Amino acid sequence: EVQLVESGGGLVKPGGSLKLSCAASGFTFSNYAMSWVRQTPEKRLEWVATISNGGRYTYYPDSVKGRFTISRDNAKNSLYLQMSSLRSEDTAMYYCARHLYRYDVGGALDYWGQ
Amino acid sequence: ISVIPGMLSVIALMTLFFYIFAIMATQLFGERFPEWFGTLGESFYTLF
């Protein structure tokens, strides 16, 4: 019963914010790490954020550092991502991904969303 | 409490071994697995 769906999105003016979500069901959510991967409409993939299981250690690329905000709550069994002061080159597709091996960060990614 | 001053040497030696194996472990297993062995002030806890 492993499933990953999403919410949020739409149209944001340059100078606004957007706060997404990710619904996770089926596995045990408190024993994996979770990460957002983006897909440009020009057929190219790019990485956004990741976060370990306990929620204390985050990692960020340098190209978007200090601007995005990622968090976890264990009991709610869902994932967040908070944006602020967007730009124009963010017109793309987003996804929500679980890592492969348990307790890990940064290996592969086996089950995405849609 | 009257026994521990004739026993303090072994305690100092075991603390030294914790310091050595902690500084080995926190840079071997530190890229991946960040919550257990990431810093040093939690690698002491995982080795304990």
Side-chain angles (χ1 to χ4, degrees), chain A residues 2-114, chain B:
Chain A
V2 180
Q3 293 294 111
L4 291 176
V5 297
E6 298 84 3
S7 65
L11 180 63
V12 179
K13 292 181 175 67
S17 297
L18 188 58
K19 188 176 178 68
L20 295 168
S21 293
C22 180
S25 67
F27 51 82
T28 307
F29 186 73
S30 176
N31 282 320
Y32 289 107
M34 203 65 63
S35 181
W36 298 94
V37 177
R38 74 184 181 185
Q39 183 181 4
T40 61
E42 299 178 354
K43 299 295 182 182
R44 188 180 67 187
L45 294 172
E46 197 180 7
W47 175 59
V48 172
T50 191
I51 177 168
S52 71
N53 56 358
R56 286 182 287 172
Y57 284 165
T58 69
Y59 296 109
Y60 279 146
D62 193 74
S63 69
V64 294
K65 186 173 174 62
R67 190 176 70 178
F68 291 107
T69 304
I70 183 169
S71 294
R72 287 171 61 93
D73 191 2
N74 289 321
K76 291 181 177 66
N77 294 319
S78 181
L79 186 69
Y80 296 156
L81 176 62
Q82 186 174 2
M83 306 165 76
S84 67
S85 300
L86 302 179
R87 287 194 293 264
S88 67
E89 62 270 16
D90 304 335
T91 60
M93 184 61 72
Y94 282 175
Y95 297 109
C96 181
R98 180 177 64 87
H99 291 282
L100 181 64
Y101 299 107
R102 290 188 290 116
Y103 292 97
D104 196 5
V105 296
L109 297 173
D110 67 348
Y111 187 78
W112 290 4
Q114 57 189 357
Chain B
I1 294 173
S2 69
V3 182
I4 196 171
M7 194 261 285
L8 189 142
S9 174
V10 179
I11 291 174
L13 182 61
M14 190 183 69
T15 306
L16 198 67
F17 279 124
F18 279 123
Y19 184 72
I20 294 168
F21 284 106
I23 200 173
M24 286 178 68
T26 187
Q27 293 182 357
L28 280 174
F29 303 109
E31 295 179 355
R32 294 173 177 266
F33 295 92
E35 189 175 359
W36 295 343
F37 293 97
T39 174
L40 181 141
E42 297 289 320
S43 178
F44 276 115
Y45 183 76
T46 303
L47 289 178
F48 182 69

